[PDB]
Design an enzyme around this catalytic site. Structure first.
Site, PDB file in Angstrom:
ATOM      1  N   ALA A  26       0.832  -1.196   0.000  1.00 62.24           N
ATOM      2  CA  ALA A  26       0.000   0.000   0.000  1.00 62.24           C
ATOM      3  C   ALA A  26       0.873   1.255   0.000  1.00 62.24           C
ATOM      4  O   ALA A  26       1.838   1.350   0.759  1.00 62.24           O
ATOM      5  CB  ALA A  26      -0.921  -0.004   1.208  1.00 62.24           C
ATOM      6  N   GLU A  28       0.663   5.812  -0.294  1.00 59.07           N
ATOM      7  CA  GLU A  28      -0.098   6.907   0.311  1.00 59.07           C
ATOM      8  C   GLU A  28      -1.504   7.046  -0.279  1.00 59.07           C
ATOM      9  O   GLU A  28      -2.462   7.288   0.453  1.00 59.07           O
ATOM     10  CB  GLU A  28       0.657   8.231   0.151  1.00 59.07           C
ATOM     11  CG  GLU A  28      -0.036   9.429   0.802  1.00 59.07           C
ATOM     12  CD  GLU A  28       0.764  10.716   0.713  1.00 59.07           C
ATOM     13  OE1 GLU A  28       1.853  10.721   0.094  1.00 59.07           O
ATOM     14  OE2 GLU A  28       0.297  11.733   1.267  1.00 59.07           O
ATOM     15  N   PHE A  29      -1.617   6.892  -1.598  1.00 55.29           N
ATOM     16  CA  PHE A  29      -2.868   7.149  -2.313  1.00 55.29           C
ATOM     17  C   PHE A  29      -3.561   5.895  -2.842  1.00 55.29           C
ATOM     18  O   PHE A  29      -4.638   5.988  -3.426  1.00 55.29           O
ATOM     19  CB  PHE A  29      -2.601   8.102  -3.474  1.00 55.29           C
ATOM     20  CG  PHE A  29      -2.164   9.466  -3.039  1.00 55.29           C
ATOM     21  CD1 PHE A  29      -3.096  10.399  -2.609  1.00 55.29           C
ATOM     22  CD2 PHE A  29      -0.819   9.819  -3.058  1.00 55.29           C
ATOM     23  CE1 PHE A  29      -2.699  11.662  -2.208  1.00 55.29           C
ATOM     24  CE2 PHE A  29      -0.413  11.082  -2.656  1.00 55.29           C
ATOM     25  CZ  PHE A  29      -1.352  12.004  -2.231  1.00 55.29           C
ATOM     26  N   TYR A  98      11.330   1.250 -13.436  1.00 56.02           N
ATOM     27  CA  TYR A  98      11.504   0.140 -12.493  1.00 56.02           C
ATOM     28  C   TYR A  98      12.900   0.189 -11.890  1.00 56.02           C
ATOM     29  O   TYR A  98      13.875   0.332 -12.599  1.00 56.02           O
ATOM     30  CB  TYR A  98      11.292  -1.189 -13.196  1.00 56.02           C
ATOM     31  CG  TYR A  98      11.514  -2.381 -12.303  1.00 56.02           C
ATOM     32  CD1 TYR A  98      10.628  -2.674 -11.286  1.00 56.02           C
ATOM     33  CD2 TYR A  98      12.631  -3.189 -12.457  1.00 56.02           C
ATOM     34  CE1 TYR A  98      10.835  -3.777 -10.442  1.00 56.02           C
ATOM     35  CE2 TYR A  98      12.837  -4.283 -11.625  1.00 56.02           C
ATOM     36  CZ  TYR A  98      11.940  -4.563 -10.629  1.00 56.02           C
ATOM     37  OH  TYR A  98      12.155  -5.656  -9.800  1.00 56.02           O
ATOM     38  N   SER A 103      14.527   1.322  -2.392  1.00 55.73           N
ATOM     39  CA  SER A 103      15.028   2.512  -1.712  1.00 55.73           C
ATOM     40  C   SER A 103      16.477   2.290  -1.278  1.00 55.73           C
ATOM     41  O   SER A 103      16.853   1.179  -0.864  1.00 55.73           O
ATOM     42  CB  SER A 103      14.162   2.844  -0.501  1.00 55.73           C
ATOM     43  OG  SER A 103      12.838   3.192  -0.889  1.00 55.73           O
ATOM     44  N   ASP A 143      12.908  17.240   0.229  1.00 55.37           N
ATOM     45  CA  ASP A 143      12.799  15.933   0.862  1.00 55.37           C
ATOM     46  C   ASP A 143      13.927  14.999   0.387  1.00 55.37           C
ATOM     47  O   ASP A 143      13.704  13.795   0.241  1.00 55.37           O
ATOM     48  CB  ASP A 143      11.436  15.297   0.525  1.00 55.37           C
ATOM     49  CG  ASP A 143      10.262  16.232   0.774  1.00 55.37           C
ATOM     50  OD1 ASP A 143      10.020  16.585   1.946  1.00 55.37           O
ATOM     51  OD2 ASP A 143       9.574  16.605  -0.206  1.00 55.37           O
ATOM     52  N   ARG A 147      16.104   7.457   1.739  1.00 57.80           N
ATOM     53  CA  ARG A 147      14.839   6.750   1.527  1.00 57.80           C
ATOM     54  C   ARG A 147      14.104   7.208   0.263  1.00 57.80           C
ATOM     55  O   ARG A 147      13.251   6.490  -0.241  1.00 57.80           O
ATOM     56  CB  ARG A 147      13.920   6.883   2.745  1.00 57.80           C
ATOM     57  CG  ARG A 147      13.426   8.291   2.976  1.00 57.80           C
ATOM     58  CD  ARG A 147      12.525   8.412   4.206  1.00 57.80           C
ATOM     59  NE  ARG A 147      12.063   9.794   4.333  1.00 57.80           N
ATOM     60  CZ  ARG A 147      12.819  10.809   4.744  1.00 57.80           C
ATOM     61  NH1 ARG A 147      14.071  10.604   5.114  1.00 57.80           N
ATOM     62  NH2 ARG A 147      12.325  12.043   4.805  1.00 57.80           N
ATOM     63  N   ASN A 148      14.430   8.400  -0.246  1.00 57.80           N
ATOM     64  CA  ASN A 148      13.824   8.936  -1.470  1.00 57.80           C
ATOM     65  C   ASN A 148      14.718   8.835  -2.684  1.00 57.80           C
ATOM     66  O   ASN A 148      14.464   9.488  -3.709  1.00 57.80           O
ATOM     67  CB  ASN A 148      13.372  10.376  -1.244  1.00 57.80           C
ATOM     68  CG  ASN A 148      12.215  10.458  -0.268  1.00 57.80           C
ATOM     69  OD1 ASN A 148      11.396   9.539  -0.172  1.00 57.80           O
ATOM     70  ND2 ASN A 148      12.130  11.559   0.461  1.00 57.80           N
ATOM     71  N   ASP A 161      10.440  10.791  -5.360  1.00 62.69           N
ATOM     72  CA  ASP A 161       9.602  11.503  -4.376  1.00 62.69           C
ATOM     73  C   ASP A 161       9.379  12.953  -4.767  1.00 62.69           C
ATOM     74  O   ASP A 161       9.902  13.874  -4.132  1.00 62.69           O
ATOM     75  CB  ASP A 161      10.187  11.412  -2.957  1.00 62.69           C
ATOM     76  CG  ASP A 161       9.317  12.089  -1.911  1.00 62.69           C
ATOM     77  OD1 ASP A 161       8.101  11.820  -1.896  1.00 62.69           O
ATOM     78  OD2 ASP A 161       9.862  12.880  -1.105  1.00 62.69           O
TER      79      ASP A 161
END
Length: 274
Positions: A26, A28-29, A98, A103, A143, A147-148, A161
């Site tokens: 899942a 955020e959206f 892809y 991350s 940001d 992780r991004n 991100d």
């Protein structure tokens, strides 16, 4: 130049050309998955796919697609590529490059101390190059964090991100966000990479991260960190934003280290007063 905001910068894809191979989880959206895209030339490529949840609000649709309106303005090997969107059928989709290894922070945590310094520097140079392009476009990311950053099968790192620990002191103090505050963030990413995905400032109280940094304290050199790279971190973390290097200078610094790998042989949870 970046233009602050979908059809102008994103291709509408024909859903016939999209297949889903694997659900990831899942987002955020809505959901996140991967699969294959058939290009107009009939070439087939792997892609990341994310969907907008069923029963989305108009705000959620706008915020979701807003990513594509930004990402689609960029075309650079170290910025995640937007393949396109699906809006004329539901679920609404964003289809991107892809990246097999996911991350960067989680990837490095699984491989603690297992890469060569030159491999790590190559990752860092890719990130810096992508940021040089974003800043050339006048886009302030805000940001930038390991992780991004996503990393592909060949270890090429790309900015994605489109966060007190990653944010420059002036951006925390009064929301002064500039490309120089992204350079601050890049210094944190440099520390994250050389630390194999350790969390910046560990789990220090946020108020203490703010105060310590303001007092001149900085993250300590990662284990076995080349002196040249720790100095680059300290330069990115200059209190005076005007004294930080520009992204073009960071790329040049890393290119020199790649060309003269012997330089990396000079080696440099407590913060150090800088």
């Amino acid at each position: 130049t970046f233009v602050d905001p979908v059809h102008e910068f994103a291709k509408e894809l024909d859903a016939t050309n999209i297949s889903i191979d694997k659900v990831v989880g899942a987002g955020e959206f809505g959901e996140v998955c991967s699969g294959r895209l058939k290009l107009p030339s009939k070439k087939e490529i792997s892609v990341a796919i994310k969907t907008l949840k069923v029963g989305y609000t108009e705000k959620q649709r706008r915020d979701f697609l807003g990513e594509a309106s930004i990402m689609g303005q960029f075309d650079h090997p170290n910025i995640i590529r937007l393949e396109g969107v699906v809006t004329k059928s539901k679920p609404v989709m964003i289809v991107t490059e892809y990246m097999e290894n996911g991350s960067l922070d989680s990837f490095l945590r699984k491989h603690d101390a297992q890469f060569t310094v030159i491999q790590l520097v190559g990752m860092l140079r890719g990130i810096a190059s992508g940021m040089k392009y974003l800043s050339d476009m006048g886009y302030v990311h805000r940001d930038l964090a390991a992780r991004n950053i996503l990393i592909n099968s060949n270890l090429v790192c790309k900015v994605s991100d489109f966060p007190i620990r990653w944010t420059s002191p002036e951006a925390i103090a009064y929301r002064k966000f500039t490309s120089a505050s992204d350079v601050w963030s890049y210094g944190i990413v440099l520390w994250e990479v050389m630390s194999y995905g350790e969390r910046p400032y560990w789990e220090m109280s946020n108020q203490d991260v703010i105060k310590a940094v303001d007092e001149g304290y900085r993250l300590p050199p990662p284990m076995d960190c080349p002196a040249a790279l720790y100095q680059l971190m300290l330069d990115c973390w200059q209190k005076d934003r005007n004294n930080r290097p520009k992204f073009e200078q960071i790329v040049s610094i890393l290119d020199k280290l790649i060309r003269n790998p012997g330089s990396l042989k000079i080696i440099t949870s407590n913060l150090l007063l800088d």
